[PDB]
Amino acid sequence: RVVGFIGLGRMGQAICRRLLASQMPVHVHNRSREKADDLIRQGAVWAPDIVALTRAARVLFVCTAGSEAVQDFYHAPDRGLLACLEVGDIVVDLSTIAPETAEGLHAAFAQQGADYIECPVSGGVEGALAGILSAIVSGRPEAYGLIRPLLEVFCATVTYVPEPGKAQRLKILNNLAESINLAGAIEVISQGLSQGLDLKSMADVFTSCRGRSAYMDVALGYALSGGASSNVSLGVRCKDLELARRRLPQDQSYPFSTLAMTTFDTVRQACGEESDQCQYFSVLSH
Amino acid sequence: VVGFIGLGRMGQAICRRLLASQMPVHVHNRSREKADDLIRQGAVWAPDIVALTRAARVLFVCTAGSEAVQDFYHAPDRGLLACLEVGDIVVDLSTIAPETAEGLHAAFAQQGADYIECPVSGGVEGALAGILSAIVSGRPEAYGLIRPLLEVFCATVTYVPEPGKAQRLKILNNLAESINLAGAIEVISQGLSQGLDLKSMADVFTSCRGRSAYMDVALGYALSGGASSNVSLGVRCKDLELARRRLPQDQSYPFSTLAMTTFDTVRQACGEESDQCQYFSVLS
Ligand SMILES: NC(=O)c1ccc[n+]([C@@H]2O[C@H](COP(=O)([O-])OP(=O)(O)OC[C@H]3O[C@@H](n4cnc5c(N)ncnc54)[C@H](OP(=O)(O)O)[C@@H]3O)[C@@H](O)[C@H]2O)c1
Ligand SMILES: NC(=O)c1ccc[n+]([C@@H]2O[C@H](COP(=O)([O-])OP(=O)(O)OC[C@H]3O[C@@H](n4cnc5c(N)ncnc54)[C@H](OP(=O)(O)O)[C@@H]3O)[C@@H](O)[C@H]2O)c1
Ligand SMILES: CC(=O)CP(=O)(O)O
Ligand SMILES: CC(=O)CP(=O)(O)O
């Protein structure tokens, strides 16, 4: 069964590699075609546009960053997804997007007799390549049941929360906690270095004692490797912080949340959109 | 025979695990009634540091605050330093200032005894399951002598010989705990205000990469309707204050400083012995 895939960024490429590794036939499309080259070498089929992709595939994955990509891929007249879908098609959107955007796409797909599956993921490039991503899934149960065995190829945990927009709500809150944990872990590692502590002992303690977190692991991996990419850009991190910022209530202060939004915005301004989320390390020391 | 001093939340749990292994344990505590349930489990009451040292060549200590360091170690004639025999070992499970641990290492060595600086992590839950993590500083011969004892209630033991080093690592680890905890509570509270159910947030915040040991703490508090996490605001701020005193003058650490001020505010509003998770109520 042929599956399509749009968005060959860091996460998209990694999920595609996992699908190819299970011997799924995969047709791939990206705005920047050079990011398909390695996938093509490994058996993927290039689709130059959404028309060609939808001809071949009745189930498609989307893994892009930003609201402009939502607009271009879904709503471009004649050329976009909504114009090319057939009745019974399913799109599994793995992007992190605003819940109201996801809700609107659920409704637009239903009008066409197709199904939007809202499927944000967590686990990074590393989890994609090992096939152990966590998915949060909103959408209708029959379409979910049909694509569920596909998610199994690259996911370990899948949380089905049917209400449209609910998966994105949970993902954005998950990533706010990532951002707080990451900034704290970088501060704690940095202080330890200034205090004379060796990275090996800090890694030993911060993975075994209860300061441990998934993103402490990220920060330690970054420090231990001398800056090997965590494969999350500040552009992607700040996109999610901005989604969270727009959901902050006017009646209660959340200082750690608001600090995380401002902190990574400043690091983005100082280091550039494509630089690593962990570049807070270098900003911290100035 | 093992002695144990300090039967607070963590001490009682470690003692329970020691006793479950059928080790002889003699216990002492300032507040006598905290021993009764340990004695029901086979512990032997020691009225005295003197009585404790007469029975045991290896003593555990598990107290909170610098006043307890002064009262138990430096009491003239009656304190630990006066009662120690050559060859004795005191295994201190408390979180204290690194310079305090350094002084005790030296004071013990000059009594011909050994101070083993052994802060732990895992909470009461981890102690009862015997899977605490330990960070250990001190001399290798004494460390080797007490390592099999640690194995009764620990799963991981990180040996960093340099005196003061285990406490430096503990304090930093607990700074990360405090930041993670505050963040977890903010995220859960916002989720509730946005109409997400706790069950969904628990499924996601444990499987996705916002997960952490203290997110699990915050979730268990909310799912249980406020059952104790067995860490008081007094203990949490004790460790934050030890971190504050180690901040440099020339560099800002905003999340670290926010954690210190936030939990101070919670402590002041909710009381020394209230749960560290009372940040939930300050946010309500
Ligand atoms: N990185 C992670 O570890 C991770 C983990 C969980 C979730 N995510 C989510 O996965 C998605 C992708 O993240 P990434 O890290 O892969 O981002 P990325 O590496 O920056 O790739 C971004 C993708 O979006 C496409 N895109 C952006 N603007 C576009 C436009 N105007 N028109 C067409 N295509 C456009 C890019 O196309 P070009 O290649 O032509 O620029 C690229 O395919 C995001 O929603 C992110 O939140 C990432
Ligand atoms: N999850 C945890 O609770 C946890 C995990 C890791 C590390 N720790 C560390 O473990 C140690 C104990 O924590 P806890 O949570 O068990 O605190 P706790 O429940 O408050 O017990 C504190 C202990 O200190 C004793 N104490 C305090 N001041 C004293 C004094 N002046 N003279 C004599 N005894 C004194 C108390 O005696 P009374 O019983 O007479 O008050 C009690 O036994 C702390 O250093 C803490 O940082 C705690
Ligand atoms: C930014 C992002 O979603 C990365 P994650 O896999 O959740 O760590
Ligand atoms: C406060 C404290 O040290 C508790 P922990 O076991 O590290 O969570």
Could you state, in order of their start, the residue ranges of all structural domains in chain B? 1-162, 163-284
What angle do the packed helices B233-244 and B165-193 form, to 10 degrees? 120
**CA–CA dist A102, A45 (Å, integer):** 28
Q: Which atom of ligand 4 is nearest to the CA of B132?
A: 6
C-beta neighbour count of A82 within 10 angstroms: 19
**CA–CA dist B216, B129 (Å, integer):** 17
Q: Show the tokens assigned to B23.
A: 């080790």
CB of residue A122 inside a 6 A radius of ligand 3: yes
**CA–CA dist B41, B20 (Å, integer):** 8
Q: Identify the H or E element spanning A155.
A: strand A155-160
Judged by CB atoms closer than 8 Å, whether chains meet at B200 and A284 is answered as no
Mutation choice for A interface testing from B179, B185, B208 by most A CBs within 10 A: B208
CB of residue A7 inside a 6 A radius of ligand 1: yes
> Cα–Cα distances in Å, from B133 out to A9, A205, B122, B167, B219?
39, 8, 6, 13, 21
User: Is the separation of the CB atoms in B234 and A227 below 8 Å?
Assistant: no
User: Is the separation of the CB atoms in B95 and B171 below 8 Å?
Assistant: yes
Shortest-distance Cα residue to atom 1 of ligand 3: A237
**Residue B114 assigned to a binding site:** no
- Measured between CA atoms, how close is B45 to chain A, in angstroms? 32
| b/e burial code for range B178-201 (CB count within 10 A of at least 16 → b) | bbbbbbbbbbbbbbbbeebeeebb
For this experimental structure, what is the resolution in angstroms? Answer: 2.0
Taking CA–CA distances from A162, the nearest residue in chain B reads B200
C-beta neighbour count of A77 within 10 angstroms: 7
CA proximity to B3, closest of B74, B80, B66: B80
Experimental method: X-ray
**CA–CA dist A180, A186 (Å, integer):** 10
